[PDB]
Amino acid sequence: KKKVIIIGAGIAGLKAASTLHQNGIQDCLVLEARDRVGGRLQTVTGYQGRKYDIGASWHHDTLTNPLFLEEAQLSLNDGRTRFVFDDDNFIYIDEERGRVDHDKELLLEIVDNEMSKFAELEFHQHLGVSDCSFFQLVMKYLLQRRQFLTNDQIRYLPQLCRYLELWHGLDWKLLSAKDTYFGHQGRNAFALNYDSVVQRIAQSFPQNWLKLSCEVKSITREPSKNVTVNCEDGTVYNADYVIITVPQSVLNLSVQPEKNLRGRIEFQPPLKPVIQDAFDKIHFGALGKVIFEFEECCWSNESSKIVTLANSTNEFVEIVRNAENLDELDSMLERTSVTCWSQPLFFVNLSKSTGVASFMMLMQAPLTNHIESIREDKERLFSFFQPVLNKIMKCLDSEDVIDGMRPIENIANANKPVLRNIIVSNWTRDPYSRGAYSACFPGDDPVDMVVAMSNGQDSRIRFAGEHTIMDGAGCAYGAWESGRREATRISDLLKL
Template identity: 45%
Template sequence: MTDSTIETKIVIIGCGIAGLKAAQELYQQKFCQDVVETAPQVLILEARDRIGGRLYTVDGLNDRYDIGAAWHHDILRNPLFQEEHELKKKNLTASKYIFDDDYGIIFDEMGTKLNHDKDLKLEVVQNELEKFVELEYFSELEYPNTSYFKMVQKYLFRYKDFLTDAQIKYLNGSARCIELWHGTNWKKLSGKYAQMDHQGRNAMCLFYKDVVDRMATEFPLDWIKLHSQVCQIKALKDKQERISNRNRNLEILTKDTKNGKITKVLCDYVIVTIPQSVLEQSLYDVPAPGRIEFIPKLNQDIYDSFQNIHYGALGKIIFEFDSAWESKHTRFYYTGAINNNIIDAVRNGQAFNGEYLNKIDSLTTPTYNNTITEQLDPQNYPLLFVNYMGITGKPSLVMLMQDPLTSYIEKLNAQDEKATICNIFKPILLNLFKHLGYAHANNHNGSIYSEILPGLKNIIVSNWTIDPYSLGSFTACYPDDDPIELSLSLERGQSMRIRFAGEHTIMDGAGCVYGAFESGKREAQYILNNYF
């Protein structure tokens, strides 16, 4: 039973960057600009109470922060960055950006700085490891797609005679920093797809809210309908059914997330831009918040491609302090705790086989399923700290973490356990202070956090694994996954009228904001080419 009916031509589900770009492209190509209608001919249905999707800028006490995506990646071929740059040159509305790529500082659980060391030469052997992985996968067409963890261990076993004990130990830490690109553990991560060939530098966006707000002004405001959770998409294939539904081809049911009212939306085309993790729920007949039921069910090729792909969960914690520190380095990598016994295990290994790998596995941080029932120690996981003193001049740290730590910390935050979060990261932060040059000895500011960590006045924690409209962050590849099949099946679409966009539907820019941006443009052009 529906409470109301809306008729339109095109529906876009999700008002993230892909949905915004699709709407912008439709309007810029004159779609409906010259048509006088009583109702919008394009509707963007957004379940949240805001636009932007996984682009989400929050206000802190020191500054603003992007709690979701924060960078323009691959600037040599990033059309969104180029668009923003051109607007900036013309003094038009555009977000700011800063090139914050930095060699950074790598430190361990004792606070020891590991890179730029003339004896350890960690950067040199790290580069050699990456080249080894690349050459291995080029060595034969059917080379097994194993985990990145196993590829690292294969390198250490094969070349241990040319490595020092310290290099064997610390490569087990520095190699794991790749987890902070993918949002998942190196034992789950595909060795074949873990290392990325970056197309230029990265520029931190200051801030994505400005990009989102700018794009939302480039088509009619009444196209956007917030608090509209899509529950069902039905293709009206029967002629009589179409006649009874005003000769439209699709019927979409939405639920108002504030009052629960059901609205029927009749249209001819739909672009579905929800995240891969949320779309996956549509494959199974299990009710879940954010799940969309497709009638008929999603095509077999889409179903099959989802069996060979996964997604990560990159989370963030923002630590805000009340006084400045010396360092302007923008990036600090923490390796995670490393078991010294791993050196002897590598040295004494006689054969690279299952027994050997099980021994190494037992000396490293275990993986976990999605359901975490025990306490995790952040000291066992690599972390990335972005230093805002080197970016905006504000005494704040933005920390990036990966699953399973992301799920664990976001669950603690949902239980209002911020003090617990401060306590469990305290040892790592105290070691980081040595490299920041932060004089914190008696710096109590009256906040509950400064009682735990001197000078700390506020923390902000992401909630992407808890948010039913994101359920993580972006595409990640496990061993034997095939990201190409997913992007191809979704680019083909469910039909010519049911289309898909988002970072998971495109190869060039997969996992990146600009990939989602380009996919929105692609689908708008597809509909324009077919509509007329």
Template identity: 35%
Template sequence: MSVKEVKVCIIGAGISGLKTAHTLLNDPRSKFTKDDVLIVEGQDYIGGRVLTDKTSSKLGYSYDLGGAWFHDALTNVVLKESIEDKSFDLNKDGYFDDLEHVYYHNDHKGELPYNKWRLNKVGEELFKFIEIYYYESLDRKDMNLLEITDIYIERYGDRLTPEQIKYLHQVARYSELWFGVASDKISAKYSAMSHEGRNLYNLKGFSFLVDKLLKGIFRENILLNHKVSKINRADKYIETQHGTIKFDYLVVTVPLSILKLPQDHEYGITWEPKLPASMTEAIDKMSFGALGKVIFEFDNIWWDNEIERFVLLSEDLDNKDIGEPLKSLPKKSKYPILAINYAAMHKNEKASLVLLTQSPLTDYVEAHPEEAWEYFKPMLEQIVTKDKKISEPINVMTTKWTQNPYARGSYSAVLPNDDPESIIVQLSGELEGVALSHSPIRFAGEHTISEGDGCIHGAYMSGQREAEWIINNFFFSKKLAKL
């Protein structure tokens, strides 16, 4: 068992860890050198939840199994920098897939007249209602998205048409494909989203960003297959199966799902001494979802290739158990699905549909990819064009995030009664006087930042934040507290 010493140790080689190391090694204000920085990664590859599969497609597509869009295009730093340094070519590599969605529902033949029935406007009003509802009083109890939809209908049902009442829960459930959890697990209070501009789909895959960051990091700065089991914050060292690493500064970028594990869990981290209660409570009060992807490739396009996104709404079930783990394939259309037409996005005729799924469907399908087509086929039959018939896929792929013990899902999600603000306060270290503010133990990752939370650019900025804090602290201040 080896003992290493390093000035800055970074746990995790995902985007936030890579950006931390890159900034430490390249920022003009920094004097850290190659030997000062070490990334310790549990898995056998670099990039974490940024993972582009360039080899599995039978049609030559690249598939991002993790993040695939530049969200918040107006303020997305990764996009801005990548355009400026020419690592991303807007015209060749980017596509704003923001055509109007086309909706289907099992009980309605053909495309649902979504806008004609003004489901778009009523859906908008629902989320505005939610915003106002919680704005009116700080004391309003949180609930789930289906329950607040009930309240909206109770209050304003006399202003709604029968179709609007019938479909509104299904309209609301579209959010499941953003948050990655079933609606009965979506916090109503935090369900209203705000976007800073459009979403740009990255056609070439986000591995370009990993590659770009790696150019500024020495390969020797990264230890793969080193699973961290312990963090001793008193004596400032971590333990992996291969030995001990002592540090001056530590940046913990493991996913929230790992931070939430019991300390004695095989993939959990034992803290010595334990983290302060304020931090563990904040971690407990935030959750982790499972947005998944199921990719079907075909030998022909049997849907309307003018359409970019098909939304297959869920059925009018009682919605009662939609958040419960699945022991077998659910009933048809129990969960809404977003199907992305890659042929339209790539302006070609290579037939691929990428379906976005939410927990618990993601968990089930990722564990049983061989059953995926059986479940999705009857839903996809709705989008078959008149002159065509549905064909069997020539290739089926699923993500594996829920199966991967280092990921355990996709990204942070706010469940009813969660408190998404505390974790930012506790882990971002940005608030003077909060436990972390002068500690050499830092956190980064999509769960530690409010701008770009859950997104690649959020993870990226959180890594930069921590690197800059360490540079300031080490070269310009030297005042350290213990955490």
């Protein structure tokens, strides 16, 4: 039947089909479980046709990102704007204090810088079976350096640096301090429609290759040198090769009993031991998103980066100043319910960088699942997030946010910000994502997963996806790369 069958039509599978096509391979299929292409790339339409990337949103590592360069070379030719560089001076807001960023007395970014360097030291060339929760690492720093920090620095620095949760979508007690501090190949570029990247790659191979709304339920290497793919609807396929691009979290279901779990793939012979073992040394984070769409911007556009700090206390300073050592420090902090001030929140002020009166808010586990479980209660959401939204507005030279999500406009706003809609992501609940992207807990190492994935179940069952490659690991451009990788190798093999 089919020369190559690609499972999943995310950026991996799409690039893999595109490469297959580019090398002259025909009779390939792309089988996608969702009713759209793009996977964790998803541009959503909200109020008055504004568009948002509820999935991946930036090109990272833009000095070296081979996908981004590709995009830049297009913009160099047709002049149009595919991305904007929106790195900015973060505006940091504590509920009580207001703006703590760029402070003459607080100097929070400076000691943040010291803690990052402290972290790079505490790990690189020493090992010692280190690794601890990003939280544990920050406590260590606070112990070693308390003599050289003010009380406010001890209060507010540990909250400010929790902006790092939104890089992985994990709370700092779940984040590997090791993974917390990784370099970045340069500025970030906010994609002005990642769906246009998807569109570009998807229309670059025959559309009759793409079969939509077709979950795959099993894959079997009849040792007679072909691969049986069995879709859920019952259609079965005879494939020379298979490129499986299902998310890491999805593939993980393959190595547990009970196969009803939607998205799982039954492997016969099952995933070989060097594959199953890697799931122990790498996990999945829950970065989530919330879009607040306002009628029009009536707040300062000083910056597109605004992070609200979780509440901090005078007695956290005291406990720090008292502990003899880290065990005493960890133990003393034994001292509820969740609000919007209970964790850091990352707000992209789109009005400055794309001219659209909306905020793009990032959130993390454990908050992400809870907020995603109530994504349709738009009134709950307005209640939960109203406090930080007003603190933002007030620090941004505006006023409290009016709930204008159902009709009846009073006409007297003009300088009051009016919320018209909220969009929420769903990746934790969507059975075909089951989290955000690869992310490690303390004591993980992607290296095992990469190796296992990159070299295949056998020569016929291959793997692509953001979890399957070292450079750009967890990023859309790694996924992309991993695609071109598998397809290039198969292209050379078919091309006889």
